[PDB]
Design a protein around this ligand. Structure first.
Ligand SMILES: OC[C@H]1O[C@@H](O)[C@H](O)[C@@H](O)[C@H]1O
Length: 283
C-alpha cells in the first residue's frame, strides 16, 4: 500500500457504503490480492456527479496506474475520462459504460437490455395489463436511463400497460419508500412498480406491506441483495433483474492488469443479466 513496489489501481463507486458497490469492491479486492496489486476504494459518501468527478481527477493527479469507474453520465464523464486517458492513465469502466469515451474496456451489465428483459417480464407476469410506476436511481445516470428506456421499449407494444409516474430515489431505501408513498396517494390506480437500482424495490415493498391491501401490487426490481431475496420469498416482490457485481469488480481488476501489461482485452464484457422469480430460489 504505502509502497511504490506495487501497481496502484483505484476503484470509484457511485456511493462508498452503498451495499451493491461494496459487493463490487469485494470482487475487485479479491482480484487485487491474487495479483498483488494495491486496490484503493475511493468514492463519494453521498452519490454526486461533481464529487465523483473530483475524486477521479484527484486519483489521476496522484499518478495511479489505472482508474476503474462508472461512466456515470455522458456529458460530464466522457471529457474527464478522455483527459485522464491523455495523461497516460488507462480507464476501465464498470457497471455503467461511457462507450463514446476513450476508456479502454467496459465490464458491466448490458443496461439497456437488462431493462428490456424487465419489461418483457412485467408484460408476461401481468399478461399485458398494468398501471405502472417507475422508481429510478436518478434521471441523469446513464445506466438508469438505459434500464428505463429498455423497459419502455419492451412494454410499448402492450396497449394495456401504461406508465403513469417516474420518480428518483437517489439510490437510498428511504427516498424509494417516500416516492412510492407519494405515488400511491397521487395515483391510487398504480398496481405495478418497476425499480431500476438495487434498493428501489426494497423501498417500494416496505410501503406496499404497510398498506397490506388485499388487491396485490406487482413489483419488479433490480439486483439480489438479501432484503430483495427475502421479499421475493415472501411474495411481496414478484421478480428482480440479476447482475454480477462481484464478477465485474474481479474482472475489471484483471482487465486493468492486462492493459497495464500491454495486452489486448475485449472492448465490452457484459456480465450475466436475467430476470429471476421466486421459483428460481435457492441460488
Ligand atoms: O443501489 C444502487 C446501485 O443499484 C445497482 O443496480 C446499480 O448497478 C449500481 O450502480 C448502483 O446504482
Amino acid at each position: 500500500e504505502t509502497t511504490k513496489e506495487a501497481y496502484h489501481f483505484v476503484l470509484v463507486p457511485e456511493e462508498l457504503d452503498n451495499d451493491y458497490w461494496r459487493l463490487v469492491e469485494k470482487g475487485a479486492k479479491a482480484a487485487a490480492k491474487e495479483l498483488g496489486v494495491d486496490l484503493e476504494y475511493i468514492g463519494p459518501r453521498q452519490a454526486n456527479i461533481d464529487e465523483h468527478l473530483r475524486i477521479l481527477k484527484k486519483a489521476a493527479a496522484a499518478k495511479v496506474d489505472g482508474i476503474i469507474t462508472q461512466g456515470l453520465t455522458e456529458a460530464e464523464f466522457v471529457p474527464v475520462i478522455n483527459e485522464i486517458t491523455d495523461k497516460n492513465i488507462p480507464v476501465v469502466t464498470i457497471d455503467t459504460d461511457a462507450p463514446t469515451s476513450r476508456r479502454v474496456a467496459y465490464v458491466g451489465t448490458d443496461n439497456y437490455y437488462a431493462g428490456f428483459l424487465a419489461g418483457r417480464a412485467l408484460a408476461e407476469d401481468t399478461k399485458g395489463k398494468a398501471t405502472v410506476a417507475i422508481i429510478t436511481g436518478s434521471l441523469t445516470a446513464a445506466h438508469q436511463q438505459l434500464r428505463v428506456r429498455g423497459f419502455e421499449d419492451a412494454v410499448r407494444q402492450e396497449k394495456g400497460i401504461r406508465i403513469v409516474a417516474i420518480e428518483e430515489s437517489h439510490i437510498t431505501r428511504v427516498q424509494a419508500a417516500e416516492k412510492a408513498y407519494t405515488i400511491l396517494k397521487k395515483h391510487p390506480d398504480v398496481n405495478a412498480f418497476y425499480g431500476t437500482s438495487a434498493l428501489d424495490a426494497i423501498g417500494v415493498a416496505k410501503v406496499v406491506e404497510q398498506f397490506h391491501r388485499e388487491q396485490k401490487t406487482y413489483i419488479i426490481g433490480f439486483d439480489t441483495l438479501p432484503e430483495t431475496i427475502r421479499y421475493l420469498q415472501k411474495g411481496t416482490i414478484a421478480a428482480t433483474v440479476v447482475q454480477e457485481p462481484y464478477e465485474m469488480g474481479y474482472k475489471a481488476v484483471k482487465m486493468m492488469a492486462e492493459i497495464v501489461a500491454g495486452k489486448d482485452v475485449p472492448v465490452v464484457t457484459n456480465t450475466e443479466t436475467k430476470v429471476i422469480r421466486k421459483k428460481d430460489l435457492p441460488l
